[PDB]
Structure 1
């Protein structure tokens, strides 16, 4: 049935989605950071990616940003100049470099009025993240059920303490791919087609990887899946609770039938295997430990049990209660 659960899902959806107002502050912060960048490098561009760009932002959202510049210009030089201009403009944060890759991490804004905890990560030439944000952004426009589905899943994973890459669970981006995977390759009929495997997809090579997909969205026929949000969510929890085999299988967007063993791939960390759709050497779930997976699986099981429970009224609220 799922009528009540669906009603409940939309109610939570509206409380947790980014408000127009905060979204408008975010775009202002972005404008401010761009002006600071122009002062230091007029040719470079500052772009948003992740949840703020794809339309998948919860309240109190962090910002993922990327500086695009000429590949002949050394990224660490302008990274530092940029960082020095931010400090001088009253931002607080850190300048760091992992191997070759410089990163700025802004944690605050003492002047411009964008928070006391304004959290903002600035990368340099992370073109791949821009592209995979384009993909998620495109699926978002393809069916209206995806956005609230994702926000609810993100909310759930956060409440259940299974959204921590540093303490052995999965990034939000990983849960998005787990949602997309289910909606493309598991649910029948499919909610979505695989845009990477579209016969209309054109190759596009960026940093060695094919980032190509079919983005003529207007020419794609709508879903023949008519499930309510509630139903989709129940299918999603059920599949990862009971059917998906994490020890043996890979979440993938590179197989017409979504079938990929860990072995084919040489992925025997790989406790939870999610192959990025574009950077296919990158296991999005490499942060997941053995005890993190146990907890991720347990929470999936408990979510399936709750939604399948026969004791009425079903306490749908327990879905978002702290673990």
Structure 2
């Protein structure tokens, strides 16, 4: 596949600039070690588990950590963290308690050290396991994801709290495209594999075909650049967000908002692969979607240009 040779070259150049460095990765691992030691001061029966992009390998540089305490202990842990020189925020008695660390004054992790600690979020640990497996299955997934996250941040469409979509939402859009849209598929659907076994956690089935050594290499040989152009075009022109649901629970990837009962927030519908009652795109407003769609079209138009050379830089320019 030489169709997108120059764009692919550019993609890997940007990828190497935005990916988390080994230095920063080690630092975050070290911060996790320190925080785990602190938790074990509170309880021998509590464990501290990393999840999210750091754990899956899908992290951009200067990333925040997402951690999870598995067993409240929340208050005791928080007060102990403060005593040990961390700065942070916590609201006691919240239905979803969260400790947000914002600074470290003693343990050398930095003035701008940022870490979110939740409690018993087992589903997030499992969806991280799923994303980790996919990143191990194909070497094109990691740079594709970083580049989509970078683009989403640069174009201001990566703000759930302000009407657009979470980074996790974008990763699911990427996986859906690579499993159920592109032909030949880049990836099989591990949840729907005949070898998958049910595994019930917090009332949902988190099972998937996880024996990766038995999964053959992809029969899709497209370049990274070809994959990304295809991804942008699908969501710009082909996907029908008014009627359709991004889903990992159908063999053909076909699911309507009607069948799902997600009609009256469901402006963009992305069904979490495990917690199927959760719409990952619940944060997306009518204005947010129009802006999201507008950016997908702009990305597609850029890459479909018949001129030479194409100014690929504009893909990651702000606004």
Q: Is the 8 A contact 2:164 2:292 kept in 1?
A: yes
Q: Shift of residue 311 of structure 1? A: 2.0
SS of the aligned residue for 2:189 comes to: coil
Q: Is the 8 A contact 2:86 2:103 kept in 1?
A: yes
Q: Shift of residue 101 of structure 1? A: 2.2
Distance in 1 between residues matched to 2:27 and 2:219, nearest whole Å: 38
Q: Shift of residue 92 of structure 1? A: 0.9
Give the equivalent residue in structure 2 for 1:2.
4
Distance in 1 between residues matched to 2:135 and 2:93, nearest whole Å: 32
The structure-2 alpha-carbon separation of the partners of 1:21 and 1:199, relative to structure 1 and needing over 3 Å to count, comes to same
1:22 matched to 2:20: no
1:313 matched to 2:309: yes
Distance in 2 between residues matched to 1:28 and 1:190, nearest whole Å: 38
Q: Is the 8 A contact 2:133 2:212 kept in 1?
A: yes
Q: Work out which of the residue numbers 26, 43, 46 in structure 2 matches 1:44.
A: 46
Residues 184-216 of structure 1: CA distance to partner in whole angstroms, max 9, x if unpaired? Answer: 000000000000000000110000000000000
Distance in 2 between residues matched to 1:285 and 1:105, nearest whole Å: 23
The structure-2 alpha-carbon separation of the partners of 1:279 and 1:84, relative to structure 1 and needing over 3 Å to count, comes to same
Aligned ranges 1:246-257 → 2 under 5 Å? 246-257=241-252
Distance in 2 between residues matched to 1:319 and 1:262, nearest whole Å: 31
> What's the TM-score, normalizing by structure 1?
0.97
Distance in 2 between residues matched to 1:172 and 1:196, nearest whole Å: 21
Residues 254-297 of structure 1: CA distance to partner in whole angstroms, max 9, x if unpaired? Answer: 00000000011111110000000000000000000000000100
Q: Shift of residue 100 of structure 1? A: 2.6
Distance in 1 between residues matched to 2:116 and 2:91, nearest whole Å: 11
Q: Shift of residue 99 of structure 1? A: 4.9
Distance in 2 between residues matched to 1:35 and 1:84, nearest whole Å: 15
SS of the aligned residue for 2:289 comes to: helix
SS of the aligned residue for 1:101 comes to: coil
The structure-2 alpha-carbon separation of the partners of 1:213 and 1:108, relative to structure 1 and needing over 3 Å to count, comes to same
Distance in 2 between residues matched to 1:42 and 1:308, nearest whole Å: 58
Q: Shift of residue 310 of structure 1? A: 1.4
Q: Work out which of the residue numbers 68, 92, 95 in structure 1 matches 2:90.
A: 95
Structure 1: 5+ residue runs without aligned partners?
70-76
Distance in 2 between residues matched to 1:255 and 1:68, nearest whole Å: 32
SS of the aligned residue for 1:85 comes to: helix
Q: Which stretch has the larger CA shift, 116-125 or 89-98?
A: 89-98
Q: Shift of residue 98 of structure 1? A: 7.3
SS of the aligned residue for 1:47 comes to: strand
Residues 39-70 of structure 1: CA distance to partner in whole angstroms, max 9, x if unpaired? Answer: 1011211010000000001000010000111x
Residues 12-57 of structure 1: CA distance to partner in whole angstroms, max 9, x if unpaired? Answer: 0000000000001000110110111011011211010000000001
Residues 170-196 of structure 1: CA distance to partner in whole angstroms, max 9, x if unpaired? Answer: 000000000000000000000000000
Q: CA RMSD in A?
A: 0.8
The structure-2 alpha-carbon separation of the partners of 1:65 and 1:302, relative to structure 1 and needing over 3 Å to count, comes to same
Q: Is the 8 A contact 2:75 2:92 kept in 1?
A: no
Q: Work out which of the residue numbers 115, 121, 140 in structure 2 matches 1:120.
A: 115
Q: Shift of residue 96 of structure 1? A: 2.1
Structure 2: 5+ residue runs without aligned partners?
none
Q: Work out which of the residue numbers 277, 290, 296 in structure 2 matches 1:294.
A: 290
